[PDB]
Hints:
The protein has 216 residues and is α+β, with helices and mostly antiparallel strands. 23% of the residues lie in helices and 20% in strands. The protein has one domain: Alpha-Beta Complex (Cathepsin B, Chain A). The protein has helices spanning 26-43, 51-57, 69-78, 119-128, 141-144, and strands at 6-7, 82-83, 104-106, 111-113, 132-136, 150-151, 163-173, 176-182, 194-198, 212-214. A hairpin with a 2-residue loop joins strand 7 (163-173) and strand 8. Helix 1 crosses helix 2 and helix 1 (26-43) packs across helix 3 (69-78).
Amino acid sequence: RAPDSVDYRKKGYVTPVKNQGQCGSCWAFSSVGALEGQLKKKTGKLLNLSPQNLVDCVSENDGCGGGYMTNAFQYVQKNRGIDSEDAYPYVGQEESCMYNPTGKAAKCRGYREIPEGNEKALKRAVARVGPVSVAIDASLTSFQFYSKGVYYDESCNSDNLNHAVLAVGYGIQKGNKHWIIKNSWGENWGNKGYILMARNKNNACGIANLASFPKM
């Protein structure tokens, strides 16, 4: 059975919250976050991977204009690696795809997608795999200005996916089931960079609509 609660932050699988700045590269941060969880699970080391490497090199995505996590996972697999933040630092604007002969820090052997809208399946992938990349509707003022509690807003549009985040756990607080979400808007956003989003409330905000994790 999948446990009632799991929080990968307590297991050391999650790196510190980052700020994508003025670049709409959420998909790049969500993607490296899933890869950091898998790298930690396979090797024992926790290390910051490079979102800039993806922003600059995933030709199939739109850099600061948006992109898909699957495309990013495909790229790391085909390119046989992704550099560390240290070898390829984030600058928050698209640049030429640079090649660092010694920057390679992790590889990816593919990825899996969670079936559309299935929160139960998302719960199991989280419990068995680790952190998982997901997309949601983050357009509401109530999301943008969140600060605490379990987030739930009836106006969230599960068909309006416009932001990529990372699910690092799930649980329940004061009787409300939730997903623990790591954002990439800095530590001053939400609750130290995190948000709890209602779980099992009919795919609120489309949380189980475009979920995937890398295979390592």
